[PDB]
Amino acid sequence: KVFGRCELAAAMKRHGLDNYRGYSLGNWVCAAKFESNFNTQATNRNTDGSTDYGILQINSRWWCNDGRTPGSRNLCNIPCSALLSSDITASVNCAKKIVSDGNGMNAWVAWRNRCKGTDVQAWIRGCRL
Ligand SMILES: [Cl-]
Ligand SMILES: [Cl-]
Ligand SMILES: [Cl-]
Ligand SMILES: [Cl-]
Ligand SMILES: [Cl-]
Ligand SMILES: [Cl-]
Ligand code: NA
């Protein structure tokens, strides 16, 4: 599923991401934009052999199981395919664990490089929330 900007903002808010661990909704929408272009089916292979999955490009090295990432973990206790669903519940729940891991949203390199410090409120501007 390819979400609209405000549609994703609304879904993220309903699932409790607005100000989760202090990160306003615009941060999450901005991260999703540059990670996946709002596409739940996005996948991308990493140099180390792991793969990133879903709207927030969650990786198989630590967070989900895809059966092909040696020496990895599955700390969110989910198959990585669950992260590609039109239902973003699994992605959100896993994202909550990741952002609580210690480095906050810096876990998402694209958030650090393209969202952090910017006017992220722009990403939810005009949205009925
Ligand atoms: Cl957009
Ligand atoms: Cl915001
Ligand atoms: Cl594996
Ligand atoms: Cl599994
Ligand atoms: Cl949803
Ligand atoms: Cl933080
Ligand atoms: Na894994």
Curated annotation (Swiss-Prot):
Its main location: secreted. Its EC number is 3.2.1.17. Disulfide bonds join 6-127, 30-115, 64-80, 76-94. PROSITE patterns: GLYCOSYL_HYDROL_F22_1 (PS00128), GLYCOSYL_HYDROL_F22_2 (PS51348). Substrate binds at residue 101. GO terms for biological process: cell wall macromolecule catabolic process; defense response to bacterium; defense response to Gram-negative bacterium; defense response to Gram-positive bacterium; killing of cells of another organism. Keywords: Allergen, Antimicrobial, Bacteriolytic enzyme, Disulfide bond, Glycosidase, Hydrolase, Secreted, Signal. It catalyses: Hydrolysis of (1->4)-beta-linkages between N-acetylmuramic acid and N-acetyl-D-glucosamine residues in a peptidoglycan and between N-acetyl-D-glucosamine residues in chitodextrins. In the egg white and polymorphonuclear leukocytes. CDD domains: LYZ_C (cd16897). InterPro entries: Glyco_hydro_22, Glyco_hydro_22_CS, Glyco_hydro_22_lys, Lysozyme-like_dom_sf. Residues 1-129 form the C-type lysozyme domain. One of its GO terms (cellular component) is endoplasmic reticulum. GO terms for molecular function: beta-N-acetylglucosaminidase activity; identical protein binding; lysozyme activity. The active site is at 35, 52. It is found in: Secreted. The keyword Secreted applies. Lysozyme C is capable of both hydrolysis and transglycosylation; it also shows a slight esterase activity. It acts rapidly on both peptide-substituted and unsubstituted peptidoglycan, and slowly on chitin oligosaccharides. Lysozymes have primarily a bacteriolytic function; those in tissues and body fluids are associated with the monocyte-macrophage system and enhance the activity of immunoagents. Has bacteriolytic activity against M.luteus. Monomer. PANTHER family: LYSOZYME C. Belongs to the glycosyl hydrolase 22 family. This is Lysozyme C. The gene is LYZ.
